[PDB]
Amino acid sequence: SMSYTWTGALITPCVYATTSRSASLRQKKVTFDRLQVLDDHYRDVLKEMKAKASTVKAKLLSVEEACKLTPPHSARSKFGYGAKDVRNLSSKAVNHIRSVWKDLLEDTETPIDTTIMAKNEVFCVQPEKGGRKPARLIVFPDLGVRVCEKMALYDVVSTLPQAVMGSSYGFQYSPGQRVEFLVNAWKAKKCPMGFAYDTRCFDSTVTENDIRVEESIYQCCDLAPEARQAIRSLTERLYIGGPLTNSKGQNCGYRRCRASGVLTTSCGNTLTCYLKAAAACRAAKLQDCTMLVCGDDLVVICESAGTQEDEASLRAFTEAMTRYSAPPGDPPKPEYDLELITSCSSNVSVAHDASGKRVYYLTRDPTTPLARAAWETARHTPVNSWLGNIIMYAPTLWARMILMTHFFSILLAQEQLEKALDCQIYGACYSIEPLDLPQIIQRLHGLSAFSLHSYSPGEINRVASCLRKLGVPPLRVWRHRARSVRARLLSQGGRAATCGKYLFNWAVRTKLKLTPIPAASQLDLSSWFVAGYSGGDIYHSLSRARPRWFM
Numbered sequence: 001s002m003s004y005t006w007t008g009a010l011i012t013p014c015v016y017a018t019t020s021r022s023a024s025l026r027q028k029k030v031t032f033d034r035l036q037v038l039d040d041h042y043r044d045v046l047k048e049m050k051a052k053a054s055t056v057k058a059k060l061l062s063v064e065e066a067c068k069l070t071p072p073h074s075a076r077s078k079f080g081y082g083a084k085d086v087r088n089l090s091s092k093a094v095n096h097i098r099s100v101w102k103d104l105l106e107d108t109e110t111p112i113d114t115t116i117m118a119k120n121e122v123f124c125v126q127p128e129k130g131g132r133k134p135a136r137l138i139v140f141p142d143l144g145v146r147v148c149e150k151m152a153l154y155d156v157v158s159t160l161p162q163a164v165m166g167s168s169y170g171f172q173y174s175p176g177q178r179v180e181f182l183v184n185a186w187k188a189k190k191c192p193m194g195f196a197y198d199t200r201c202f203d204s205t206v207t208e209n210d211i212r213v214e215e216s217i218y219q220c221c222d223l224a225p226e227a228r229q230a231i232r233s234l235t236e237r238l239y240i241g242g243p244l245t246n247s248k249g250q251n252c253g254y255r256r257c258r259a260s261g262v263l264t265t266s267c268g269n270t271l272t273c274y275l276k277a278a279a280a281c282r283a284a285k286l287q288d289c290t291m292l293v294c295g296d297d298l299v300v301i302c303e304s305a306g307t308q309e310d311e312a313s314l315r316a317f318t319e320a321m322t323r324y325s326a327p328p329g330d331p332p333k334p335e336y337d338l339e340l341i342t343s344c345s346s347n348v349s350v351a352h353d354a355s356g357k358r359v360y361y362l363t364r365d366p367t368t369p370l371a372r373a374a375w376e377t378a379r380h381t382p383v384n385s386w387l388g389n390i391i392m393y394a395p396t397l398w399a400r401m402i403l404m405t406h407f408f409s410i411l412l413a414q415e416q417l418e419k420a421l422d423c424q425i426y427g428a429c430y431s432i433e434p435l436d437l438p439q440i441i442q443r444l445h446g447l448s449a450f451s452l453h454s455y456s457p458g459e460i461n462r463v464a465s466c467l468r469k470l471g472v473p474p475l476r477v478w479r480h481r482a483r484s485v486r487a488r489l490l491s492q493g494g495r496a497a498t499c500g501k502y503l504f505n506w507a508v509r510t511k512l513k514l515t516p517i518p519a520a521s522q523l524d525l526s527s528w529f530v531a532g533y534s535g536g537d538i539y540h541s542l543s544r545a546r547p548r549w550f551m
């Protein structure tokens with residue numbers, strides 16, 4: 001079948017930002033027929049995955065529990081209620097949610113309607129590597145269907161990927177734990193070889209069989225009878241496909257591939273990518289494979305068979321993935337240094353802590369983080385990528401010296417340090433106060449994240465070149481700015497002084513001891529690095545369990 005079918009009605013509207021004006025360029029790329037051929041390797045891996053899914057017991061969420069997972073700014077329903085009414089358990093919201101649920105139990109076939117829209121993402125204007133990127137399209141069902149998805153599948157998509165893929169499931173790892181996994185896997189090989197595999201329009205390559213095989217994995221869970229029917233009905237009416245409706249309410253066509261804005265997008269993509277890749281590893285006869293999968297993002301670490309043999313096994317891996325309908329964008333290349341593998345646009349780098357000890361950490365090219373941060377300072381935005389980047393890339397030179405200094409200077413000026421802000425972590429939305437950042441960083445990266453030095457020449461040059469390219473003042477200006485920022489924060493006491501002392505210890509001439517923050521342990525981070533939820537429409541507010549009067 002065709003991944004998509006179009007009527008001709010436009011995808012109407014809701015350093016550059018991507019708009020609906022480029023949607024036509026994306027539509028051309030994502031529209032094609034899929035030719036999938038399965039084999040014994042695929043069926044074997046699938047049976048192995050299902051045997052692991054069999055150990056899972058999933059709970060049906062109540063209306064109230066599902067309502068609480070709804071983001072405050074989640075797209076309103078076309079049936080006269082919004083995200084605020086859902087969160088407050090309003091009579092109209094709850095009634096419509098209960099009628100949608102009943103309809104999923106009684107109707108097993110009628111396709112559910114979805115909205116199609118162009119995503120507005122900020123990217124850096126690079127004329128050296130061609131031109132602008134067309135907008136990525138987002139396909140999502142109505143708010144009421146989105147609440148029912150959580151009731152039926154929130155526990156499944158949170159528990160199942162880990163039970164099935166084990167250590168291969170990328171979203172169970174904080175950036176440091178991801179780093180620890182890769183270092184340990186690389187060290188485990190006599191002669192290691194690693195590669196990243198990028199699929200061209202992964203969502204489009206997802207066939208209805210891929211989606212039915214994904215349900216066969218869900219059906220291995222211990223499920224409540226109504227959860228079982230809702231999964232069956234949601235697969236048939238929503239997940240395999242359905243009609244597309246633009247922002248103006250006009251028919252845009254149809255979809256027969258993965259919808260990017262459903263709860264099962266991350267889980268489904270991860271299970272599908274793992275299945276195809278694990279099977280392809282066998283077809284290519286790659287020895288002692290270790291995989292790390294995050295949706296469509298795959299990294300394979302294996303035992304090298306020699307330079308020529310490694311290139312031949314990669315073409316074989318690619319031939320198998322292509323048969324499974326997962327062809328590459330850019331063909332994969334073998335790497336023989338862990339630092340050379342770029343996965344989720346990130347790479348491993350090393351530094352030293354205060355005592356000269358080596359510390360591995362995850363970094364990335366800072367152009368997009370800085371360009372998006374510049375856009376976010378220029379105009380008000382719903383989600384703050386700057387906050388998510390400080391959290392995830394806390395040990396990096398660029399997040400410490402530029403993102404922290406810049407945003408703490410703004411927060412000091414606006415007197416908004418205590419004001420909670422929304423950020424994205426593995427697709428889920430988190431409401432976080434900037435004052436909690438020292439504690440969040442200590443928990444995810446360790447106390448060493450505040451003492452790191454001896455950055456590599458390559459990492460330093462990438463940062464310095466990026467600042468020049470973007471017209472950002474040099475690193476010496478940032479150290480000078482951080483000293484004033486730090487001084488002002490220190491004078492305020494409490495969590496504000498903790499921000500000063502810990503986040504900006506790199507800026508002082510002499511450098512302080514830095515003892516662990518005692519209130520860091522109180523932070524409830526139980527739901528943080530469990531699963532991926534991109535497109536899932538998931539929200540969580542940061543909570544502090546058992547506070548002490550003096551902390």
Ligand SMILES: O=C(O)/C=C/c1ccc(NC(=O)C2(NC(=O)c3ccc4c(C5CCCCC5)c5n(c4c3)CC(=O)Nc3ccccc3-5)CCCC2)cc1
Binds near residue numbers: 370371374377473
């Ligand atoms: O050689 C020396 O001894 C000193 C050199 C030197 C050079 C430039 C300055 N610049 C400044 O003071 C001003 N801008 C900045 O002090 C500035 C701060 C952050 C900037 C950012 C981002 C960085 C990440 C957080 C969000 C802001 C960008 N740009 C920035 C400029 C340059 C800019 O204007 N825009 C962009 C566009 C895309 C990406 C980044 C930027 C403020 C008043 C005049 C311009 C200061 C000192």
